[PDB]
Design a protein around this ligand. Structure first.
Ligand code: HEM
Lengths: 438, 55
């Protein structure tokens, strides 16, 4: 039984949340913000990601070089990432270097220069990033997947933004973005590892007390997405591996079906020919795929947002003449979540998940990421006892009912990249979303 | 004719052959499809369709 997550607020409405571990000697402190690319419009799309670059380009006190030196002298590192709904800025350090790291984070968030010279310099760096994501096939597939599933909607936009915006982003719009979005009621200061909660609250009172509050404070993790059944094909005969994602509209963080969708996802599970144990997994799809050499890997996913989600599978295969079989067998395993699953699969998946949700948190950065994610999506850290109860409440009837309303005979978003000549047209893929025998 | 003019022998043999010939015709219809299967259907533009096929 893990130590209790302590939570305090400041007057502005900044949440401080901590989980101490007296067995480690490092600490991860950082700021989780309930804001990301989705908060941009079409004209300033790319701003949030642009700011992330400039946050490390110098503040009103420390220059770019001084910033570098200060962190080098601390001994640990700083890291940041911007997603569609969430931005994170954290610092991993030694136990007693925590006050330094909180001070640096407070500086780069509140007091960043955003100097025209630096805007202009990064504008090329970010332009080069547009032509090099092209290599990260999983990311290419998932970005096209969001773009098509949420066609012409904010969740459909990329994080980098269009080339056009990169050339026209000004310090004015950068400043406007972080003034509107980086408000105290949207921010959580998180500490995990060798942190004292009371010490962290004091550091918050010292550095984050002059943060603006938003005019209308909504609760943390407050949001209408209209999913489009659709396909993007990026055929490239020169690539040896096909990458395919298939998804349906999934569940939000606060859906009542959140755990049901996780259990369903665990019934299909993951597979990777490179891992020794994968040929012995219990999942039916795993057995079909491994026996017939249909794929190098597959990974089931259930991505959530504040008001929607995507539930589906990502496949990679070199078997270019049997892509049809791979997709066919995958979707017939999904059909069985509607028609055939019983207590046998459901209780097996529950067993696997009860551990999986706890195992994931195996270092201070993972713990901080868990506290930060849960605080910015649900408004609270959910105790493992509550999570164990919600998983236990999932029955086979719940899984069947969920799959019959979410998967069965529903539109999919489909992205294929690589040698995908063998991937059939939309109708034949979508026809596998039901079974004529049932 | 089976005789010196069209008559009963002719009619009976035409019945037997008329019954047969549609089966022969079905076999040749199958043969021309199997022969076609090597190139596939042509299309109204007269170009290859190997670039863009539909089930
Ligand atoms: C019982 C008579 C016949 C049947 C049932 C039949 C059936 C078919 C079918 C199903 C096809 C493929 C689909 C299509 O293109 O329409 C086809 C293609 C073809 N048939 Fe016939 N056929 C018959 C008689 C003939 C005759 C008399 C000729 C030529 C004198 C012919 C020459 C062809 C050719 C060249 C094609 C390929 C056309 C193409 O797709 O470019 N067939 N036939």
């Amino acid at each position: 039984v893990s130590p209790k997550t302590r939570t305090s607020n400041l007057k502005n409405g900044l949440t401080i949340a901590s989980e101490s571990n007296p067995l480690v000697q490092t600490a991860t402190v950082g700021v989780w913000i309930d804001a990301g690319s989705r908060n941009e419009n079409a004209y300033n799309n790319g701003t949030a990601h642009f700011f992330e670059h400039l946050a490390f380009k110098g503040t009103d006190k420390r220059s770019q070089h001084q910033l570098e030196l200060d962190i080098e002298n601390m001994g640990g590192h700083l890291n940041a990432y911007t997603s569609r709904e969430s931005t994170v800025y954290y610092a991993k350090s030694f136990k007693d270097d925590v006050p330094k790291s909180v001070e640096i984070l407070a500086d780069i968030l509140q007091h960043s220069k955003l100097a025209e010279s630096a805007i202009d310099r990064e504008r090329e760096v970010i332009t080069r990033e547009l032509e090099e994501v092209n290599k990260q096939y999983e990311e290419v597939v998932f970005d096209h997947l969001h773009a098509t599933a949420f066609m012409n909607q904010p969740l459909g936009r990329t994080i980098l933004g269009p080339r056009e915006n990169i050339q026209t982003i000004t310090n004015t719009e950068l400043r406007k973005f972080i003034t509107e979005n980086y408000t105290a009621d949207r921010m959580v200061l998180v500490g995990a590892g060798a942190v004292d909660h009371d010490a962290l609250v004091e550091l918050a009172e010292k550095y984050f007390s002059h943060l603006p509050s938003s005019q209308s404070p909504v609760p943390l993790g407050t949001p209408i997405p209209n999913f489009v059944g659709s396909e993007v094909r990026l055929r490239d005969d020169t690539m040896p591996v096909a990458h395919i994602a298939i998804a349906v509209e999934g569940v939000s963080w606060t859906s009542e079906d959140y755990y049901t969708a996780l259990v369903a996802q665990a019934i299909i599970g993951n597979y990777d020919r490179a891992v020794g144990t994968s040929r012995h997994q219990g999942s039916r799809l795993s057995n079909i795929v491994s026996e017939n050499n249909l794929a190098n890997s597959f990974q089931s996913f259930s991505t959530s947002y504040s008001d929607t989600g995507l539930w589906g599978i990502y496949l990679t295969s070199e078997n270019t003449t049997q892509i049809d079989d791979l997709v066919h067998f995958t979707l017939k395993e999904w059909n069985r979540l509607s028609t055939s699953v019983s207590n046998l699969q459901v209780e097996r998946a529950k067993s696997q998940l009860k551990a999986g949700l706890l195992l994931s948190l195996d270092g201070t950065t993972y713990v901080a990421e868990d506290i930060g994610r849960q605080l910015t999506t649900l408004g609270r850290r959910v105790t493992p006892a509550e999570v164990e109860a919600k998983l236990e409440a999932v029955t086979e009837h719940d899984v069947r009912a969920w799959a019959q309303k979410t998967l069965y005979d529903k539109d999919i978003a489909l992205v294929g990249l690589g040698p995908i000549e063998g991937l059939y047209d939309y109708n034949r893929i979508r026809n596998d979303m039901s079974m004529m025998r049932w | 004719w089976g005789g010196f003019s069209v008559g009963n022998p002719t009619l009976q043999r035409f019945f037997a052959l008329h019954y047969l010939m549609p089966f022969v015709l079905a076999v040749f219809a199958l043969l021309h499809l199997i022969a076609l299967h090597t190139a596939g259907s042509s299309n109204p533009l007269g170009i290859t369709s190997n670039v863009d096929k539909l089930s």
